Amino acid sequence: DAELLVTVRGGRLRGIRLKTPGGPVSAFLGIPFAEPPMGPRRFLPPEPKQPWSGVVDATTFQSVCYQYVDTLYPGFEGTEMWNPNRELSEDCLYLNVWTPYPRPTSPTPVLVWIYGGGFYSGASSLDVYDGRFLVQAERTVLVSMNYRVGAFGFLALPGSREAPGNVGLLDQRLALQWVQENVAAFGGDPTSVTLFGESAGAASVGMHLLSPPSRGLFHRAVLQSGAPNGPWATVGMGEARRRATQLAHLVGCPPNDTELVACLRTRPAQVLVNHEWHVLPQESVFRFSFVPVVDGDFLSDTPEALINAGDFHGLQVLVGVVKDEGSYFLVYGAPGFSKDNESLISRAEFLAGVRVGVPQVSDLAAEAVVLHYTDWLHPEDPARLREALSDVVGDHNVVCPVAQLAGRLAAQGARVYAYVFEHRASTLSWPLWMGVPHGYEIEFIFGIPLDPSRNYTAEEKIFAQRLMRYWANFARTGDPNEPAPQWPPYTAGAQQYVSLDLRPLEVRRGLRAQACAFWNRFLPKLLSA
Amino acid sequence: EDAELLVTVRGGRLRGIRLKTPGGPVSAFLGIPFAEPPMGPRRFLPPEPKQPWSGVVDATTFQSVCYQYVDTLYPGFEGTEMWNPNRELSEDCLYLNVWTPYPRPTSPTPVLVWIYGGGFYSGASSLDVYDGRFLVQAERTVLVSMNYRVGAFGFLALPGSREAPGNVGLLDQRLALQWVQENVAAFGGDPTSVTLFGESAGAASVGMHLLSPPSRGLFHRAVLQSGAPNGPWATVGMGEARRRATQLAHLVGCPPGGNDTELVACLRTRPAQVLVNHEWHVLPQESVFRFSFVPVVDGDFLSDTPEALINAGDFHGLQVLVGVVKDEGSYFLVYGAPGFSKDNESLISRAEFLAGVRVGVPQVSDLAAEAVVLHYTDWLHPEDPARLREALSDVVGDHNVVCPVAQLAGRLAAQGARVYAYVFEHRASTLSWPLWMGVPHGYEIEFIFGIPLDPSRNYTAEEKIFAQRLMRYWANFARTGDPNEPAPQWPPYTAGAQQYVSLDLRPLEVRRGLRAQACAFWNRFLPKLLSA
Ligand SMILES: *[C@@H]1O[C@H](CO[C@@H]2O[C@@H](C)[C@@H](O)[C@@H](O)[C@@H]2O)[C@@H](O[C@@H]2O[C@H](CO)[C@@H](O)[C@H](O)[C@H]2NC(C)=O)[C@H](O)[C@H]1NC(C)=O
Ligand SMILES: *[C@@H]1O[C@H](CO[C@@H]2O[C@@H](C)[C@@H](O)[C@@H](O)[C@@H]2O)[C@@H](O[C@@H]2O[C@H](CO)[C@@H](O)[C@H](O)[C@H]2NC(C)=O)[C@H](O)[C@H]1NC(C)=O
Ligand SMILES: *[C@@H]1O[C@H](CO[C@@H]2O[C@@H](C)[C@@H](O)[C@@H](O)[C@@H]2O)[C@@H](O[C@@H]2O[C@H](CO)[C@@H](O)[C@H](O)[C@H]2NC(C)=O)[C@H](O)[C@H]1NC(C)=O
Ligand SMILES: NC(=O)c1cc[n+](COC[n+]2ccccc2/C=N/O)cc1
Ligand SMILES: NC(=O)c1cc[n+](COC[n+]2ccccc2/C=N/O)cc1
Ligand SMILES: *[C@@H]1O[C@H](CO)[C@@H](O)[C@H](O)[C@H]1NC(C)=O
Ligand SMILES: *[P@](=O)(/N=C(\C)N(CC)CC)OC
């Protein structure tokens, strides 16, 4: 079958044909785009894959980059759907390509997916990132890569040449460079690449927006439940060096940078994973040890500084959030919370949870949060405290950082479309008090409901095809609308967004404008003084 | 001679007048001297009791208003002239008034003692709106009201000095209450059921008597209307009080600081009007709701600041009734806030809103000012002129009245005091102020005193029935410590439930929270900001 045979620049590839309820697609899985960053190349920037002879087996997903594996609810589908479904290895820099069957003979718009996972986990092989449905239903080319996470991707000894940091981000950029030189061989159009990602993936997208070497490798961005400007996606040079130095102490290696990292390179990958989470300064939720570092190279400044100073005329972006972004993170450290529970916390637990949810800030800053999120007519209602604390970590970490990004880019040339995903899947295993948790719009954007092997309803499948068309319309034209209630662009003044559920589109104003004026306008003034 | 118009108190004999009311006769003793005139060498000094006199003193009309400033902003306007002096100005002005039923009560009768407001720089017991004939006539009580020194004459302080110890306007009130305990029984009043009640600076004064032990033994209940002792305007530290007194002396010509006795003595040689003409040039900033000479926290009258006394006080066996009106901040904005006027709709721009915030909250850091802007901005309509207008009035009202009143009420309730709270939501048919001002500060007073029953006035019918209902509310609290009639009930205010009633033409409506969200900011968070 000649359709499964592609010659990229490194050599020849053999793909596989896959079935969907709407017809077949061509897939090429486990395409090597970098030399394996092992041994002496641990922590170093990625190197392009040297050419090979013969035919590369591109019929199965490759290995998952070494990462922590969640153990909180063993066997629970809500946690295991994000866990690795392939074996772990540092040899993990492969990407996957999905195109229609037979492969297009005309340039096709390309979508590049960057997975999330707090920069410590994730894999392009997860079932919920299956690109076969989007490609068949909307006739695009979908690409997805694996980038290093945790210490292997983002341990930085700033100023070092052996651990410069952000190497997980250059992994993504190298894949985007691979796209520009090779996607046309699959029928893709390298002059219409649309980045999209969720959570840390969405944050990774925005950082490519603000890094000029990456800007020439794609044309639009979709940021779902993530942003580069939040309080969790970046770290300073000094804190990055402290965390890298402590991890080395915890693994028995002596805190000279080059001998330090040389000793780290002698440690099995598993032992570094086992200690990465204990270099955090304080017991926290939504805080991660090894994230991108602001060191003047990849980002010449902090994301907020580059957002405020940038000219964004000629750029379209699609941004949004789920209804209850905070719900999911509080079962991982917030006092009194559990998924097998109503989690009707007390005031003591609420205030205790505020220091966990808003870590590393002064007492005054913490009390300011409590005042804004307390109903002083119902100061101790457990149901209200449960939802207020979810709003705290949800607004602080996702809703407000994204609302700021949307407002600034719109006011500075970019055309922005904003959504909030308000449908709770019928297959959701999480309790009802969590509502629509973080990350559970992805399965609908990838058309997972169309899989007849699953228990989604008829309306949900129609809903999935609605959002696939929205996303694909944006990739094709920079406008999600169908040329029906129209989706208006978000602006700093009107602050208009739409709600995505089984009902038709509903236009609303303000992404929690009151609560995010607190985080985006007042709090920064409070800490600097 | 009419025997009911002749009363013997300790100072000597008095003669009063017979007042005709719509409901019947009332005996009034207006202009009773209770202190020696604080003139010349006695200026700035504590009041001395009135020396006994021979013969009969004609206590038959209101005496002079204590020297004070006269408002000239809207000349001839009824809304401003009703607060201006209606008698001659003079430093000889320490006189009180007594209204009693005709004939005098057979048995002891509860006593209401009124303390007027005016930002501690103005006011007088003779204002038509404080006429006590209808209250005494309708509810058969004894109403006492006194004058006290305002402005620099009442509250200029050089702390530690003996020549100008400060707070002398408060001891004027205290001596008047001491007069009530010794002489009100001669009019038929009960010295062991005396209920203080005042409005604005009067209410702040009433509260400071709660927290100073020498005053607390002279009354039994309290009514605080649109004022509290803990507001950011009713007291001043010892140092700023000395700075204002010293520069007032400088601006008038004394000395040509130094020695207190020497400096005060030179101030005594200056005409009273000259002091009044300069007392507002000492305020540190352009402001509204700030007053140059107010009670000073010196450790004497108030051993500590009112907030700390309220928090450290045991108030068991004590009943107070507190409240505010619906739109408290509107009156003060036409006196300095940019873009405001009673003759316009005062639909300010956002630039004038932010400028108005600095006037409404003076002497605070830039961080605190922006914290105010955050909580009072509607970030979905940040520049709507109408919303900005009511936002600024909410800023002024909450910061200076509503929240101060709310914290006092909550701390008293939690520490053993039965509290009742209200919000006055009726806009009088005769109101001269524009519509955008709502129910302004100080306009519940005329309904409390029964003024609508005056036949010369053109109040509606229903407002008269309203006035009778509130007069009954106020009198029931005076007699029994509970405003309820022995109809829907008025529940006590507690720190948890925070229940209060609406006062208007419809029946009582129970509600929760006196701007709880807004005032949690003023009472709980903002005090933590200025510290750090
Ligand atoms: C909700 O449960 C939480 C979590 O407790 C775990 O999950 C429960 C289903 C049950 O199996 C518990 O035994 C588990 O430990 C409770 O929060 C815990 O409460 C226990 C005491 O009951 C305490 O010892 C733990 O420290 C708490 N853990 C945390 C993270 O706060 C909570 O009490 C339950 N809430 C209810 C029942 O309303
Ligand atoms: C502050 O001044 C008073 C007044 O001083 C008197 O009059 C002045 C014009 C000056 O010329 C002084 O010499 C006079 O004594 C002082 O109070 C007087 O103090 C003296 C001496 O202690 C005493 O004999 C008088 O009785 C006092 N007269 C009063 C109280 O009216 C006071 O001591 C001065 N304070 C200082 C200088 O710190
Ligand atoms: C509304 O009124 C204020 C008050 O101004 C005065 O009263 C008006 C009724 C009218 O008679 C004006 O001519 C008076 O000056 C206005 O604010 C003033 O505007 C003038 C004109 O530029 C300015 O010189 C003053 O400084 C302003 N005063 C303050 C306190 O800001 C206001 O412009 C009037 N109109 C509107 C639409 O707001
Ligand atoms: N070093 C790390 O960043 C890290 C963070 C969290 N975990 C474990 O995952 C907990 N968790 C798992 C899934 C979703 C949220 C969370 C809570 N994070 O604070 C391991 C390593
Ligand atoms: N003694 C003074 O010079 C003086 C000057 C200004 N004020 C303030 O008056 C303006 N004002 C401001 C707010 C409310 C009322 C009023 C008018 N009261 O008569 C008081 C005293
Ligand atoms: C969901 O699908 C599974 C397939 O493994 C099936 O066993 C289960 O019965 C389904 N649930 C419902 C409610 O149909
Ligand atoms: P309060 O003393 N009362 C005022 C200004 N007033 C005039 C309307 C009522 C007497 O203000 C602080």
Side-chain angles (χ1 to χ4, degrees):
Chain A
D1 191 349
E3 297 292 326
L4 311 193
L5 300 185
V6 172
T7 288
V8 290
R9 297 226 225 150
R12 298 175 296 152
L13 308 170
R14 185 189 316 278
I16 186 177
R17 185 169 39 84
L18 312 176
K19 305 179 285 155
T20 86
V25 315
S26 322
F28 303 84
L29 321 180
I31 302 168
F33 68 94
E35 293 288 306
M38 327 198 66
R41 274 221 210 80
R42 179 187 273 166
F43 308 121
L44 293 183
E47 219 166 6
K49 180 65 171 185
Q50 278 302 296
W52 63 86
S53 50
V55 195
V56 156
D57 187 356
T59 78
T60 181
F61 279 122
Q62 262 293 338
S63 318
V64 176
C65 300
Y66 249 94
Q67 55 178 258
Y68 175 84
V69 173
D70 194 40
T71 41
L72 182 82
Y73 297 129
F76 177 61
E77 213 257 338
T79 62
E80 308 272 16
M81 66 182 277
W82 314 106
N83 275 335
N85 52 353
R86 298 292 185 278
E87 311 296 280
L88 314 170
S89 148
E90 305 190 79
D91 190 348
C92 64
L93 294 187
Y94 305 81
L95 49 84
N96 325 281
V97 182
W98 287 268
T99 88
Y101 191 90
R103 293 162 22 194
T105 49
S106 324
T108 306
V110 188
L111 282 144
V112 179
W113 171 255
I114 306 166
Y115 58 76
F119 296 112
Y120 76 87
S121 64
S124 47
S125 63
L126 304 189
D127 299 336
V128 59
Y129 307 148
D130 196 339
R132 81 180 70 197
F133 300 97
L134 256 172
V135 169
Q136 191 284 316
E138 297 299 331
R139 298 196 62 81
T140 56
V141 167
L142 194 135
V143 185
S144 97
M145 86 286 285
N146 271 7
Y147 60 100
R148 301 165 268 178
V149 288
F152 314 92
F154 297 100
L155 177 137
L157 277 187
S160 89
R161 61 165 43 193
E162 300 105 351
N166 304 319
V167 296
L169 288 177
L170 293 184
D171 291 351
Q172 309 173 341
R173 170 180 297 169
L174 177 64
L176 290 175
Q177 299 175 357
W178 190 96
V179 161
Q180 285 292 309
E181 317 172 322
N182 299 283
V183 68
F186 302 87
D189 189 5
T191 68
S192 155
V193 181
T194 301
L195 279 181
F196 72 130
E198 193 265 353
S199 168
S204 306
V205 171
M207 307 183 70
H208 291 294
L209 278 177
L210 307 155
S211 195
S214 285
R215 188 64 196 92
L217 309 177
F218 64 99
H219 305 78
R220 317 157 165 129
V222 184
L223 295 92
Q224 316 171 17
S225 320
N229 40 306
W232 56 269
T234 52
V235 85
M237 282 171 58
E239 176 71 3
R241 173 175 291 281
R242 184 198 71 80
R243 297 174 180 188
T245 307
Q246 160 147 66
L247 175 82
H249 165 266
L250 294 163
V251 305
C253 282
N256 197 350
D257 290 356
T258 84
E259 211 64 271
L260 184 69
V261 54
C263 191
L264 286 174
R265 277 199 269 257
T266 73
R267 294 297 185 264
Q270 193 54 53
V271 315
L272 264 52
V273 172
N274 296 341
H275 292 85
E276 67 162 7
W277 200 9
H278 304 325
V279 309
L280 275 192
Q282 215 63 269
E283 296 282 331
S284 36
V285 303
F286 218 132
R287 293 298 181 273
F288 319 112
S289 317
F290 298 102
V291 298
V293 68
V294 179
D295 61 340
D297 193 359
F298 199 101
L299 317 150
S300 38
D301 212 329
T302 73
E304 288 98 323
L306 299 153
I307 287 162
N308 297 331
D311 189 351
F312 295 99
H313 279 98
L315 173 84
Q316 302 88 30
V317 282
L318 181 52
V319 305
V321 284
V322 303
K323 194 166 179 287
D324 308 276
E325 291 273 343
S327 38
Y328 161 87
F329 297 90
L330 304 175
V331 311
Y332 287 95
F337 280 81
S338 180
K339 81 170 199 62
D340 301 307
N341 228 340
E342 287 274 76
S343 322
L344 300 164
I345 52 166
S346 52
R347 183 113 185 130
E349 285 173 333
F350 171 77
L351 310 156
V354 170
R355 301 299 329 217
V356 166
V358 200
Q360 299 291 276
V361 298
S362 65
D363 287 336
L364 179 70
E367 251 286 300
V369 175
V370 176
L371 170 94
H372 185 92
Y373 287 83
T374 297
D375 186 328
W376 298 98
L377 278 164
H378 313 282
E380 320 225 340
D381 185 24
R384 283 178 174 102
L385 298 154
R386 188 231 286 132
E387 312 192 11
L389 185 62
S390 148
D391 281 341
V392 170
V393 314
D395 303 338
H396 175 44
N397 294 289
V398 182
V399 181
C400 298
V402 170
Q404 174 157 63
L405 174 79
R408 302 304 263 122
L409 309 172
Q412 295 168 208
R415 201 206 296 150
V416 179
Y417 295 87
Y419 67 88
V420 52
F421 181 84
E422 290 199 313
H423 173 66
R424 181 186 166 97
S426 68
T427 63
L428 214 76
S429 38
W430 294 103
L432 306 92
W433 69 257
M434 298 188 40
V436 188
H438 169 83
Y440 285 90
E441 89 287 10
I442 302 176
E443 58 201 42
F444 282 79
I445 297 165
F446 279 79
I448 307 301
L450 303 183
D451 190 355
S453 147
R454 309 184 174 248
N455 297 340
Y456 289 88
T457 80
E459 318 91 85
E460 281 177 329
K461 283 149 131 166
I462 294 159
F463 181 55
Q465 310 176 301
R466 268 188 63 219
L467 310 172
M468 288 192 306
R469 183 68 55 84
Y470 285 142
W471 258 240
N473 281 9
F474 174 74
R476 282 187 293 264
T477 68
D479 187 345
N481 291 284
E482 275 276 47
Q486 292 280 128
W487 186 340
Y490 181 96
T491 88
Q495 298 164 83
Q496 275 171 309
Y497 68 91
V498 307
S499 62
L500 302 177
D501 51 19
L502 303 171
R503 306 171 312 140
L505 272 205
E506 189 186 297
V507 176
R508 301 169 186 179
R509 289 197 61 237
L511 286 160
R512 308 200 176 187
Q514 293 305 126
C516 291
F518 170 80
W519 301 98
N520 298 326
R521 301 171 185 272
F522 176 63
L523 210 83
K525 303 173 169 62
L526 189 143
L527 301 176
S528 54
Chain B
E1 209 79 286
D2 190 330
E4 228 63 71
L5 298 193
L6 313 165
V7 172
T8 291
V9 306
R10 301 303 186 278
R13 289 179 291 156
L14 302 143
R15 179 176 4 242
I17 55 180
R18 154 172 189 159
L19 289 181
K20 313 164 130 163
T21 70
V26 174
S27 318
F29 298 87
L30 316 179
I32 306 169
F34 66 91
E36 290 287 319
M39 312 174 97
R42 279 171 156 106
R43 175 196 276 172
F44 308 124
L45 290 190
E48 320 166 30
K50 178 62 174 175
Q51 301 163 359
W53 64 86
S54 75
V56 177
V57 159
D58 284 311
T60 66
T61 187
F62 287 120
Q63 259 280 20
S64 323
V65 177
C66 290
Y67 252 107
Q68 62 189 231
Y69 171 82
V70 187
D71 182 57
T72 78
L73 169 63
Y74 295 119
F77 180 56
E78 315 77 283
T80 54
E81 297 298 345
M82 61 177 288
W83 308 111
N84 272 338
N86 62 343
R87 291 294 198 273
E88 79 171 75
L89 311 183
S90 148
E91 292 193 65
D92 177 17
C93 60
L94 292 189
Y95 303 84
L96 56 86
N97 316 302
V98 184
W99 288 267
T100 192
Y102 186 106
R104 291 208 287 273
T106 78
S107 37
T109 298
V111 184
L112 290 169
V113 188
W114 173 251
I115 309 182
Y116 57 76
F120 298 102
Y121 69 85
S122 64
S125 63
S126 53
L127 301 183
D128 302 331
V129 278
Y130 305 145
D131 186 1
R133 68 181 74 191
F134 320 96
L135 254 189
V136 161
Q137 194 282 306
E139 292 301 323
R140 194 228 192 249
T141 37
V142 174
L143 188 89
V144 174
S145 84
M146 95 293 292
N147 266 20
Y148 64 95
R149 296 174 269 167
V150 292
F153 307 99
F155 297 101
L156 178 135
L158 292 154
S161 91
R162 185 231 170 250
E163 282 306 309
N167 291 346
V168 298
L170 283 179
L171 291 168
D172 290 344
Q173 309 169 10
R174 172 179 285 173
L175 175 61
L177 300 175
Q178 288 169 338
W179 187 95
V180 172
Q181 281 301 308
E182 311 185 0
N183 300 296
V184 85
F187 305 88
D190 193 352
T192 64
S193 99
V194 168
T195 294
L196 293 192
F197 73 128
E199 187 268 352
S200 182
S205 324
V206 174
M208 298 181 196
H209 291 292
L210 282 182
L211 314 169
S212 199
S215 299
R216 170 81 187 97
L218 310 173
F219 61 103
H220 307 76
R221 341 191 194 281
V223 185
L224 287 90
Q225 307 174 202
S226 310
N230 47 310
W233 57 268
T235 69
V236 55
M238 297 200 282
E240 178 74 11
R242 164 167 294 274
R243 186 202 65 83
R244 300 170 169 187
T246 289
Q247 292 269 299
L248 171 61
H250 180 89
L251 294 166
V252 307
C254 305
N259 183 343
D260 280 341
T261 37
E262 205 142 355
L263 188 129
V264 175
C266 177
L267 273 167
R268 271 160 188 151
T269 77
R270 304 277 183 269
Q273 184 59 40
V274 168
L275 297 189
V276 161
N277 292 328
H278 288 107
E279 82 177 5
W280 239 237
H281 292 136
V282 311
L283 273 182
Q285 285 115 14
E286 191 186 1
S287 62
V288 300
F289 221 128
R290 286 307 181 274
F291 321 106
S292 311
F293 299 98
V294 297
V296 56
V297 185
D298 65 335
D300 198 340
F301 196 103
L302 299 158
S303 54
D304 197 1
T305 73
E307 300 98 79
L309 291 177
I310 290 157
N311 294 338
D314 169 33
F315 302 96
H316 277 99
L318 185 270
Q319 306 91 54
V320 306
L321 160 62
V322 306
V324 305
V325 307
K326 175 172 170 279
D327 299 282
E328 288 266 343
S330 72
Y331 168 86
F332 304 89
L333 308 166
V334 290
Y335 283 95
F340 279 84
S341 153
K342 84 173 187 65
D343 301 326
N344 270 338
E345 292 305 273
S346 296
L347 301 156
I348 55 173
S349 70
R350 173 134 186 115
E352 304 185 306
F353 170 81
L354 309 166
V357 169
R358 297 316 292 259
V359 173
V361 200
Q363 294 261 101
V364 296
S365 57
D366 299 327
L367 185 65
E370 290 155 340
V372 173
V373 166
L374 167 75
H375 280 253
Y376 285 83
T377 304
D378 188 335
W379 297 101
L380 280 187
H381 312 262
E383 322 206 9
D384 184 18
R387 293 166 156 109
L388 293 165
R389 173 189 71 204
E390 280 136 321
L392 192 55
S393 149
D394 284 340
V395 169
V396 177
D398 305 350
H399 174 47
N400 284 304
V401 188
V402 178
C403 305
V405 169
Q407 169 172 76
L408 152 65
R411 297 311 294 256
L412 292 201
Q415 289 146 216
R418 175 146 292 191
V419 187
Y420 295 85
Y422 67 89
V423 178
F424 187 80
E425 302 196 311
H426 176 73
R427 184 181 162 99
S429 91
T430 59
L431 202 52
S432 36
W433 292 102
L435 245 178
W436 68 261
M437 292 185 45
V439 186
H441 176 86
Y443 283 95
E444 84 284 27
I445 303 176
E446 55 203 58
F447 287 91
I448 300 292
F449 280 87
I451 306 305
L453 309 177
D454 191 312
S456 72
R457 317 251 169 186
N458 313 311
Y459 285 90
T460 168
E462 319 155 81
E463 275 166 334
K464 288 169 192 172
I465 304 82
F466 189 39
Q468 303 200 55
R469 174 150 63 85
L470 305 154
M471 285 197 290
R472 184 132 262 160
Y473 285 158
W474 258 241
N476 287 338
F477 175 78
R479 302 182 277 254
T480 79
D482 175 357
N484 269 299
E485 280 230 272
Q489 294 305 88
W490 183 340
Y493 179 98
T494 38
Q498 318 182 12
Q499 291 171 281
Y500 69 92
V501 302
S502 70
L503 292 181
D504 56 344
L505 296 179
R506 45 167 182 63
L508 286 199
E509 183 199 310
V510 180
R511 292 146 157 202
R512 299 222 314 130
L514 299 162
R515 320 206 162 187
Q517 292 306 124
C519 285
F521 159 79
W522 293 107
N523 298 328
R524 306 166 181 272
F525 173 70
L526 197 65
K528 290 178 177 60
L529 190 142
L530 321 163
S531 315

